[PDB]
Amino acid sequence: PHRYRPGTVALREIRRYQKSTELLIRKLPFQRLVREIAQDFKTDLRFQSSAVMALQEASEAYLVALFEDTNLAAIHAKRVTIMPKDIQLARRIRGER
């Protein structure tokens, strides 16, 4: 049959998801995660829907910006595959961990 070479689909998806603006994480799981994290600071809390949406926007922007630096580090090490050490180096040089 027909099979695209490993990497064509990757570039196609990179273009596709860099052309759009919608949120890439599902909403119900993210909301459950947010409520679970919050139940450790105060019990019986309520959230406005816009609060959860603001949290999701901020989180996704943060993760995309982190992946850009992770890719930079992976390329610096003369690789195309990102590894956990690249994330660790990116967060270390930024000043987070």
């Binding site: 273009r15 860099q18 890719n71």
Partner: protein, 105 residues
């Protein structure tokens, strides 16, 4: 009863800027020409960003500005991207940019 924005030749409200300065706890007193200066600077920056946003909107065959166009306009400008370097625009996306090392040869 002539307004101060019309005296200064502006669109933004000089009276509201003056009130916000007086009620923001910035100093004991507020000069007479400080609100005029600040309103002029705010209107200048607004016009600067809106012109680029409208150009980006027209480049995509659209007649309304949406957050994507604002993001494109801000990130494609060297000085606006530095003024807003730590700002996140909701529903703005990113700039299309693929590293040359990942392209096929």
């Amino acid at each position: 009863a002539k307004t101060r924005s019309s005296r200064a030749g502006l669109q933004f409200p000089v009276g509201r800027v003056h009130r916000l300065l007086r009620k923001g706890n910035y100093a004991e007193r507020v000069g007479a020409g400080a609100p005029v200066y600040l309103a002029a600077v705010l209107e200048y920056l607004t016009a600067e960003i809106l012109e680029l946003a409208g150009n980006a909107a027209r480049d995509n065959k659209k007649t309304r500005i949406i957050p994507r166009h604002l993001q494109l306009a801000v990130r494609n400008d060297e000085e606006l991207n530095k003024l807003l370097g730590r700002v996140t625009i909701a529903q703005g996306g990113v700039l299309p940019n693929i590293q040359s090392v990942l392209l096929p040869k």
